[PDB]
Amino acid sequence: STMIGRILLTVVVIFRILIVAIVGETVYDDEQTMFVCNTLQPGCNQACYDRAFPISHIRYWVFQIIMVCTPSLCFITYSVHQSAGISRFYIIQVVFRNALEIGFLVGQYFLYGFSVPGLYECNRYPCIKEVECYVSRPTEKTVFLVFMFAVSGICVVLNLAELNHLGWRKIKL
Amino acid sequence: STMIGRILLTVVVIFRILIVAIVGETVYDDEQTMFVCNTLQPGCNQACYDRAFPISHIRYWVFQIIMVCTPSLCFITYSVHQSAGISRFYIIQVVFRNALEIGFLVGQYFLYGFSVPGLYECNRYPCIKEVECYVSRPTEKTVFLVFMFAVSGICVVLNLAELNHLGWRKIKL
Amino acid sequence: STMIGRILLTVVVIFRILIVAIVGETVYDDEQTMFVCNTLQPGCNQACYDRAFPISHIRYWVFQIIMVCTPSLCFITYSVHQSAGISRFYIIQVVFRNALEIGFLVGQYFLYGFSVPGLYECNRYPCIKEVECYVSRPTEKTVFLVFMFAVSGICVVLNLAELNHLGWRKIKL
Amino acid sequence: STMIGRILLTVVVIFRILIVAIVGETVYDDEQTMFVCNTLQPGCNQACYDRAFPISHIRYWVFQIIMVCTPSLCFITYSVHQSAGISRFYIIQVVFRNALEIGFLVGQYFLYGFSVPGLYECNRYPCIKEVECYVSRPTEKTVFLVFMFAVSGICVVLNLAELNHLGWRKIKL
Amino acid sequence: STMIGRILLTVVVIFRILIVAIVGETVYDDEQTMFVCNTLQPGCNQACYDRAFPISHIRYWVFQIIMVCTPSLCFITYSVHQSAGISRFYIIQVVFRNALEIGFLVGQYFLYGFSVPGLYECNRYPCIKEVECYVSRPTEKTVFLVFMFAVSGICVVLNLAELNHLGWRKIKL
Amino acid sequence: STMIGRILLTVVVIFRILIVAIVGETVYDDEQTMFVCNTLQPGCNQACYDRAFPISHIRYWVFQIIMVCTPSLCFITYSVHQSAGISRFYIIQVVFRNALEIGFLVGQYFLYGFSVPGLYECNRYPCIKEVECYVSRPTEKTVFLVFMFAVSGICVVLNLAELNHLGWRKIKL
C-alpha cells in the first residue's frame, strides 16, 4: 500500500496549507489589541502579552509548513539541474522530511501544550507584584492547536509508513 | 436523471464557495469589536464573547467546504498517479462525500441551531454574578446560518440521489 | 434586432459586476462604526443598527449577481458535459434568468425602497422608550440604490425583449 | 496626425486608469474618520459630512472610467459576435465616447468645482444653528481634482480631433 | 559600452519600482493618524497636517514612476501598431525620458528638500496663534527621501550616458 | 561539491524570501501603535519611537533581499540582450553577490545587534528629562533578528564556498 499512502500524504499536506493560509491570520489578528490586564501601570499590557505568547502560533505553523516543504524543493531543483542517480536522493528526502515533521511536532508540544487558558498570571516589570490578564478567543485557539497537532501526527504516521516500506537495508546502504 | 444531478451539484458547490469566499469574512469582521457587555469588570467582555461564540461560523464553514472537497482531490490525485480500476474509486468517493456532508450538516445544527439571539446571558469569571451582553448584527448572521443550512441540505439531497442511482449492489461489492 | 440586445445585455452585466466589485465594499465599510444613537444605554447602538439594516445592501446585491449568473453556469457546465438537444436548454435558461432578475428587482423594492433616510427612530430593547440614531453617508447609499435599481430594470427589459423574440410557441414546446 | 492621436489617447487612458487605481483609494480612505466638527451634538458629524461630500470624488471617477470604457467593450463584443459592417460601428463608438467624455467633464465641473476648501459651514439637523467643520487633506484633494480635470480635457481634445479627422459627411449617418 | 548601460538602467528602474511598491505605502500609512499638535482647538490637527504635507511623498513618487514609464509605453504601442521607421522613434523616446527624469528630480528637490524634521511650527487657522506639532517617523522618511533622490540621480546619469553613446549627429537628423 | 552548493543556495534564498514575505509585515504591523511611554507630554511617543527604531527591521530586510537579487537580474537581462562571453560575467556576478551579502550582514549587526530590549530610555525633546518607554512583542522580534542573521550567514558561507571553487586565478583574470 505504498501508493494510497502517497495520495493521502499529498492530500493532507494540501489540506493543512489551505486551512492555515485561509483562517490562521484572521484568528490571530486581534491577539494583542484584545489582550487586557487589570492594572493602571503603563506598559504592563505589553510586557504581560510578550511573556504569555513569546511566539504566536500562526508564525510557528508558517515556519513549520515552509520548512517541511523545503526538502521537496531541494529534490525538485536537483532534478531540474540534472536535466540540461535521482533514485538515491529520494530516500534522503524522505528521511529528512520524517525528521523535520517529528521535530516540529515535539517542538509544538513542548512550546504550547494542548490548551490556551483564558487567564494569565503575570509578574513582569513594570507590573506591580502579580497581575491578572485575560486572553482573546482562548477556545478557538485551543481548537486550532489540537487540530494542527492531529494533522501533524497523521503526516508523521504516513511518513513513517512510507519509510518502513522503503526498508532498513535501502536506507542504511 | 443522473446527469442533471451532477450538473446541479457542481453548480451548487460553486455557488456556496463563491458566496462564502466573497461575503463571509466581511460579515464576521467586527464580531468581537462590537460585542459589548453591561459591566465595568476588565476581561468580562473577552470571557463572555468566548463563551457565546466558541468557534465562529465562518471558520466552521471554511473547514466544512475544504473537507467536503477533499475526496474529489483524492480521486483526482489518484487518477494523475495512475497515468504516468478508477471505476471502483468513484463509488467510494461518492460514499465518503455523502457521509461528510451529512456529518457537517448535523454538526452545524447541534453547534449553532437556527438563530443568533441579540442578547446573551453570561456568568463566567471574572464577570460578577450574571451579566447581559449584546451581539453584533444578529439578524444577518441568522440569515447566513439558515442559507448555509439550506444549501447543505440541497447538496445532501443531490448526493443521496446520485448514490441511489448507483444502486446498492455496486456499493456492496 | 436580437443581436444588439445580446451585446447590450452582456455589456450591462459586466458593468454592474465591475461597479459593485470595485466600489460597493468600500461604500459600506463604516456602516456600523459610524452609526451612532443619542443615548447612554450600552447595547442600544447594536440593536438599533440591526433593526435599521437587517441585511446590508452590498450582500443582497452580491447574492443577486451570483444567483443571476447561475443559469449561465448551468448551461455552460451542461455543454461541457455533453462533449466528451442544446437548443432546448437555451430557452429554459433564458426563462429562468428572466424570472430570477424580476424576482430580485421586486425584492429590492420591497426590502429597501428608494432612499436611505439620515435619521432613524428606534424603540428596541435595551433602548429606553424611543431613541434617535444617525446614519452614515445616507446620500451616497441612496444614489447606489437608485443606480442598482435602474441597471436591474435595464437588464429586465433586455431579457424580456430576447424572450419575446424567441416566441411564445417555442417556449411552450 | 490621426495615428499619433490614437497612440496618445490610448496612453492617456492607461495613465488615468493606473493613477486612479493606485492612489485614489488611499487618498480618500480617512475622509470621514478625520472629518470633525466643533460641536457636542451627537450625529452632527455624520450629517455635515454627508452634506459636504454627497458623493466621494473617487467613486465618481471610477464610474466615469468604466462608463467611458464601455463603448469599446460594446465594439469588441460585437466584433467577437460577428466572427463565429464593422466599419460602421467604429464611427458610432467614437461619437458615443466623445459624448460621454464631454458629459462627465461638465458633470465634474458642476458637481465639485476646482477646489476643496478646508472649512465647511453646516446647518443641517441635528446641528444647532450653524457649525464649523474641518476637512481632511484639502490640498491633496484639490490637486487630484485639477489633475483629473486636465486629463479628461486632454482626452476630450484628442477624441474631438479624431472625430474631425473622420469628417462630417461620414458621420452624417 | 552602451549595452551594459542598458542593463544597468533597466535593473535600476525595476529596483526603484519594486522598492516603492513594496514598502512606500506601509511607511506612510499612519502619517496623519500619528500626527499630533499641542493644542485643544478642534480642527487644528487637520489644518497643520495639510499645511505641513500638502502632497505625500509616496503619491509624488508614484506619479513620477508612471510618467517616466509613459514614453516606453508610447514606443511599444507604436511598434505594435506598425505590425498588422522604428529606429527613429527610439531617440525621441530617449530624449523625452531624460527630460522627464530631470524635471521630476528637480521638482522633488524644490518641493521636499533633503530632510523631514520631527517638529513643525504651524500658524494656520483655526490654531490659536502659533502651535507646535510632531511628525511620525521623520528619520525613516528622511532616509526614503535621500534614497529616492540618489536613485533618480543614477537614472539621470544613465540616460545622459545612453544619449551620448548614441551621438549628436543622429539626434540632429 | 559545487552543484549541491548551488542547490542549497537557491533553496535558502527562496526560503528567506517566503518567510519574510509571509510573516514579516504582520509582525511589525503594530510597532508604533502599541509603543507607549510613561508620560503626559504630547509628542513624546513619536519622538521616542523614532529614536528607538530609526528604520524598521522589515524594511531593511526587504531592501537587502532586493539588492542581493539585483546581480542575478543584471546577468539575466544581459543574457536576454545578447540573444536577439557570458562565462566572464558569471564570476563578476558571484563576486558582487558575495560582497553585497557580507555588507548587509555586517550592517545588520552594527545597526540592530542581536536583541530587542523590552524597555527603552528616551531623553529626546519634547520629553521632559528622561522617560521610560515599552516596546511591542520584543521577544518575537529578537527571534526574527537572530533567524535572519543565521540565514544570511548560511548564504554567505555558501557563496564563499562557490567563489573558492571557482578559484583565485579565474577571478584575477
Ligand SMILES: O[C@H](c1cc(C(F)(F)F)nc2c(C(F)(F)F)cccc12)[C@@H]1CCCCN1
Ligand atoms: O498571503 C497570505 C498567505 C499566503 C501564503 C502563500 F503565499 F504561500 F500562498 N501562505 C500563507 C500561509 C502558509 F501557507 F502557511 F504559508 C499561512 C498564512 C498566510 C499565507 C494569505 C493568502 C490567502 C488570503 C489571506 N492571506
Ligand SMILES: O[C@H](c1cc(C(F)(F)F)nc2c(C(F)(F)F)cccc12)[C@@H]1CCCCN1
Ligand atoms: O482569501 C479569502 C478566501 C480565499 C479562498 C480561496 F483561496 F480558496 F480561494 N477561499 C476562501 C473561503 C473558502 F471557503 F475557502 F472558499 C472562505 C473565505 C475566504 C476565502 C478571500 C478571497 C476573496 C476576497 C476576500 N478574501
Ligand SMILES: O[C@H](c1cc(C(F)(F)F)nc2c(C(F)(F)F)cccc12)[C@@H]1CCCCN1
Ligand atoms: O474580493 C472582492 C470581490 C471579488 C469578486 C470576485 F471574486 F468575484 F471577483 N466579486 C466581488 C463582488 C461581486 F459582486 F461578486 F462581483 C462584489 C464585491 C466584492 C467582490 C473585491 C475585488 C476587487 C477589489 C476589492 N475586493
Ligand SMILES: O[C@H](c1cc(C(F)(F)F)nc2c(C(F)(F)F)cccc12)[C@@H]1CCCCN1
Ligand atoms: O481593487 C482596486 C481597483 C481595481 C480596479 C480593477 F479591478 F479594475 F483593476 N480598478 C480600480 C479603479 C478603476 F478606476 F476602476 F480602475 C479605481 C480604484 C481602485 C481599483 C485597487 C487595485 C490596485 C490596488 C488597490 N486596489
Ligand SMILES: O[C@H](c1cc(C(F)(F)F)nc2c(C(F)(F)F)cccc12)[C@@H]1CCCCN1
Ligand atoms: O497595489 C500596490 C501597487 C501596485 C502597483 C502596480 F499595480 F503597478 F503593480 N504599483 C504600485 C506602485 C508603482 F509605483 F506604481 F509601481 C507604487 C506603490 C504601490 C503600487 C502594491 C502592490 C504590491 C503589494 C502592495 N500594494
Ligand SMILES: O[C@H](c1cc(C(F)(F)F)nc2c(C(F)(F)F)cccc12)[C@@H]1CCCCN1
Ligand atoms: O505584498 C507583500 C510582498 C510582496 C513581495 C513581492 F511582490 F515581491 F512578491 N515581496 C515582499 C517582500 C520581499 F522581501 F520583497 F520579498 C517582503 C514583504 C512583503 C512582500 C506580501 C505578499 C504576500 C502576502 C502579503 N503581502
